Amino acid sequence: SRTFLVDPNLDLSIRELVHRILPVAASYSAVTRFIEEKSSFEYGQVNHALAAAMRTLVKEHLILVSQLEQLHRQGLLSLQKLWFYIQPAMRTMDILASLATSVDKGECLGGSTLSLLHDRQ
Protein backbone atom coordinates (compact mmCIF):
# COMPACT_ATOMS: atom_id res chain seq x y z
CA SER A 1 0.00 0.00 0.00
CA ARG A 2 3.01 2.28 -0.46
CA THR A 3 2.73 5.41 -2.60
CA PHE A 4 5.67 6.97 -4.44
CA LEU A 5 6.59 10.34 -5.92
CA VAL A 6 8.88 10.71 -8.92
CA ASP A 7 9.49 14.20 -10.29
CA PRO A 8 7.64 17.37 -11.37
CA ASN A 9 10.09 18.03 -14.23
CA LEU A 10 11.04 14.72 -15.85
CA ASP A 11 10.75 13.24 -19.32
CA LEU A 12 7.36 11.66 -19.89
CA SER A 13 9.12 8.87 -21.80
CA ILE A 14 10.59 7.79 -18.44
CA ARG A 15 7.85 8.31 -15.85
CA GLU A 16 5.50 5.98 -17.71
CA LEU A 17 8.17 3.28 -17.49
CA VAL A 18 9.19 4.05 -13.90
CA HIS A 19 5.62 3.28 -12.81
CA ARG A 20 6.11 -0.14 -14.43
CA ILE A 21 9.07 -1.06 -12.22
CA LEU A 22 7.88 0.20 -8.81
CA PRO A 23 5.16 -2.50 -8.32
CA VAL A 24 8.00 -4.83 -7.32
CA ALA A 25 9.11 -2.42 -4.58
CA ALA A 26 5.67 -1.69 -3.15
CA SER A 27 5.03 -5.43 -3.24
CA TYR A 28 8.33 -5.77 -1.36
CA SER A 29 7.72 -3.17 1.35
CA ALA A 30 4.77 -5.31 2.44
CA VAL A 31 6.66 -8.61 2.66
CA THR A 32 9.58 -7.37 4.75
CA ARG A 33 7.05 -5.92 7.21
CA PHE A 34 5.26 -9.27 7.32
CA ILE A 35 8.47 -11.00 8.41
CA GLU A 36 9.42 -8.53 11.20
CA GLU A 37 5.93 -8.85 12.77
CA LYS A 38 4.49 -12.35 12.28
CA SER A 39 7.70 -13.68 13.91
CA SER A 40 6.31 -12.70 17.37
CA PHE A 41 5.61 -15.87 19.47
CA GLU A 42 1.95 -14.87 20.16
CA TYR A 43 1.17 -16.11 16.61
CA GLY A 44 1.54 -19.90 16.79
CA GLN A 45 4.10 -22.38 15.54
CA VAL A 46 2.82 -22.05 11.95
CA ASN A 47 2.90 -18.30 11.36
CA HIS A 48 6.57 -18.64 12.33
CA ALA A 49 7.83 -21.27 9.91
CA LEU A 50 5.76 -19.50 7.28
CA ALA A 51 7.77 -16.33 7.94
CA ALA A 52 11.08 -18.22 7.88
CA ALA A 53 10.51 -19.97 4.56
CA MET A 54 9.28 -16.58 3.32
CA ARG A 55 12.70 -15.12 4.19
CA THR A 56 14.97 -17.25 2.02
CA LEU A 57 13.31 -15.72 -1.04
CA VAL A 58 14.00 -12.23 0.31
CA LYS A 59 17.65 -13.25 0.55
CA GLU A 60 17.68 -14.32 -3.09
CA HIS A 61 16.00 -11.03 -3.99
CA LEU A 62 18.86 -9.14 -2.35
CA ILE A 63 21.39 -11.07 -4.45
CA LEU A 64 19.51 -10.12 -7.62
CA VAL A 65 19.93 -6.45 -6.74
CA SER A 66 23.64 -6.91 -5.99
CA GLN A 67 24.38 -8.49 -9.37
CA LEU A 68 22.66 -5.53 -11.03
CA GLU A 69 24.80 -2.85 -9.39
CA GLN A 70 28.01 -4.73 -10.23
CA LEU A 71 26.67 -4.94 -13.78
CA HIS A 72 25.76 -1.24 -13.60
CA ARG A 73 29.37 -0.12 -13.13
CA GLN A 74 30.32 -1.22 -16.62
CA GLY A 75 27.37 0.85 -17.91
CA LEU A 76 25.82 -2.26 -19.50
CA LEU A 77 22.54 -1.59 -17.66
CA SER A 78 20.14 0.61 -19.60
CA LEU A 79 16.70 1.44 -18.24
CA GLN A 80 15.02 -0.62 -20.96
CA LYS A 81 17.33 -3.51 -20.06
CA LEU A 82 16.24 -3.25 -16.42
CA TRP A 83 12.52 -3.84 -17.04
CA PHE A 84 13.39 -7.30 -18.41
CA TYR A 85 15.88 -8.40 -15.74
CA ILE A 86 13.55 -8.15 -12.73
CA GLN A 87 10.67 -10.08 -14.32
CA PRO A 88 11.27 -13.23 -12.21
CA ALA A 89 11.17 -10.93 -9.18
CA MET A 90 7.99 -9.12 -10.24
CA ARG A 91 6.13 -12.44 -10.29
CA THR A 92 7.46 -13.93 -7.05
CA MET A 93 7.27 -10.79 -4.92
CA ASP A 94 3.73 -10.48 -6.29
CA ILE A 95 2.74 -13.88 -4.88
CA LEU A 96 4.14 -13.34 -1.38
CA ALA A 97 2.74 -9.81 -1.19
CA SER A 98 -0.66 -11.46 -1.71
CA LEU A 99 -0.35 -14.13 0.97
CA ALA A 100 1.09 -11.68 3.51
CA THR A 101 -1.97 -9.48 2.91
CA SER A 102 -4.50 -12.33 3.02
CA VAL A 103 -3.19 -14.02 6.18
CA ASP A 104 -3.42 -10.78 8.15
CA LYS A 105 -6.79 -9.62 6.76
CA GLY A 106 -8.68 -12.37 8.55
CA GLU A 107 -6.60 -13.11 11.62
CA CYS A 108 -5.25 -16.63 11.04
CA LEU A 109 -2.99 -18.69 13.28
CA GLY A 110 -2.43 -22.43 13.33
CA GLY A 111 -4.55 -24.55 11.01
CA SER A 112 -6.39 -21.65 9.40
CA THR A 113 -3.01 -20.43 8.11
CA LEU A 114 -2.33 -23.89 6.67
CA SER A 115 -5.66 -23.96 4.85
CA LEU A 116 -5.00 -20.69 3.02
CA LEU A 117 -1.73 -22.07 1.63
CA HIS A 118 -3.70 -25.03 0.24
CA ASP A 119 -6.31 -23.01 -1.66
CA ARG A 120 -3.89 -20.38 -2.94
CA GLN A 121 5.69 -21.48 -11.75
Partner 1 sequence: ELVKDVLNVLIGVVSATFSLPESISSLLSEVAEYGTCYTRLSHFSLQPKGLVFQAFTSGLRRYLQYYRACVLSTPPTLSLLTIGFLFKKLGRQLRYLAELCGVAFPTGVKLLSYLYQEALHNCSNEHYPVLLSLLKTSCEPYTRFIHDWVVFLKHIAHDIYVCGKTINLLKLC
Residues of this chain that interact with partner 1 (CB under 8 A) are 12-13, 16-17, 78, 80-81, 84, 87
Q: How far is CA 81 from CA 30, 67, 68, 72, in A?
A: 26, 14, 11, 11
User: Are the C-beta atoms of 54 and 31 separated by less than 8 Å?
Assistant: yes
Residue 23 or 110: the one with the smaller Cβ distance to partner 1 is 23
Q: How far is the CB of 93 from partner 1 (least distance, A)?
A: 14
Cα separation of 13 and 11, whole Å? 5
Residues 6+ apart with CB under 8 A from 86: 21, 24, 64
Q: How far is the CB of 99 from partner 1 (least distance, A)?
A: 15
User: Are the C-beta atoms of 97 and 30 separated by less than 8 Å?
Assistant: yes
Residue 41 or 84: the one with the smaller Cβ distance to partner 1 is 84
Q: How far is the CB of 17 from partner 1 (least distance, A)?
A: 6
Chain-centre distance for alpha carbon 24: 6
Q: How far is the CB of 45 from partner 1 (least distance, A)?
A: 32
Residue 9 or 80: the one with the smaller Cβ distance to partner 1 is 80
Residue 68 or 109: the one with the smaller Cβ distance to partner 1 is 68
